[PDB]
Amino acid sequence: LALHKVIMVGSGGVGKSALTLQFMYDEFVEDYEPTKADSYRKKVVLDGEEVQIDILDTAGQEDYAAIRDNYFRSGEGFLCVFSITEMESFAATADFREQILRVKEDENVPFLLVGNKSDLEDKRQVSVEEAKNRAEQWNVNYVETSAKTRANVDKVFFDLMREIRARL
Ligand SMILES: Nc1nc2c(ncn2[C@@H]2O[C@H](COP(=O)(O)OP(=O)(O)O)[C@@H](O)[C@H]2O)c(=O)[nH]1
Ligand SMILES: *S(=O)(=O)c1ccc(S(=O)(=O)Nc2cccc(F)n2)cc1
Numbered sequence: 285l286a287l288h289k290v291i292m293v294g295s296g297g298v299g300k301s302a303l304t305l306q307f308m309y310d311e312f313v314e315d316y317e318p319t320k321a322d323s324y325r326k327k328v329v330l331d332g333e334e335v336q337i338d339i340l341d342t343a344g345q346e347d348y349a350a351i352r353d354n355y356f357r358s359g360e361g362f363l364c365v366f367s368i369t370e371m372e373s374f375a376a377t378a379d380f381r382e383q384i385l386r387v388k389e390d391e392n393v394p395f396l397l398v399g400n401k402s403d404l405e406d407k408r409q410v411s412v413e414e415a416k417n418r419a420e421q422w423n424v425n426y427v428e429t430s431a432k433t434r435a436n437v438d439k440v441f442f443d444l445m446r447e448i449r450a451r452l
């Protein structure tokens with residue numbers, strides 16, 4: 285079976301684990317150890333083809349640059365998550381983008397910009413417009429998600445796998 289290697293990236297508290305665990309276990313997990321990294325594997329049927337998704341839920345603990353680059357080099361697609369309620373996490377997505385591009389050397393690396401916590405509209409700090417503009421500058425798709433309501437959770441994982449399938 286095709287194995288689609290997905291890596292979750294983004295700064296702390298944006299929803300990397302909550303998104304992963306909603307996708308994996310259909311549960312909104314609000315207390316997942318912030319420093320714990322883990323891998324998840326699931327068989328899924330992608331546009332009628334049984335595939336395996338492998339998700340690396342990164343937690344930012346790896347500080348040795350060669351090892352961080354090794355992890356990114358093994359990834360095939362990236363969900364680059366920020367929280368719409370924390371402007372600084374949106375700014376931080378630029379760094380993850382650059383790190384990925386240095387390692388993958390391919391501006392067309394499968395990559396979604398993911399604005400999570402769409403259920404907290406009253407706390408929004410990042411406008412839809414500015415996130416869409418960034419995605420347009422990078423030529424990536426922008427999707428807003430909620431790990432709490434499940435809004436667009438399957439979409440980001442499936443659409444990323446579709447990009448992996450098409451591009452690699
Ligand atoms: N309301 C809301 N809270 C969220 C959402 N995603 C994550 N959270 C909360 O934000 C906190 C950090 O989420 P987590 O997934 O652990 O962030 P990570 O550090 O990026 O893995 C937790 O308390 C989650 O319950 C969301 O979509 N909506
Ligand atoms: S390794 O398997 O021992 C490992 C994997 C992930 C992490 S992390 O998620 O805590 N930090 C990190 C940062 C950047 C990329 C990446 F894959 N992981 C630590 C050790």
Ligand SMILES: [Ca+2]
Binds near residue numbers: 302316318319320342
């Ligand atoms: Ca986490």
Ligand SMILES: [Cl-]
Binds near residue numbers: 321
């Ligand atoms: Cl791991």
Ligand SMILES: [Cl-]
Binds near residue numbers: 401
């Ligand atoms: Cl939150």
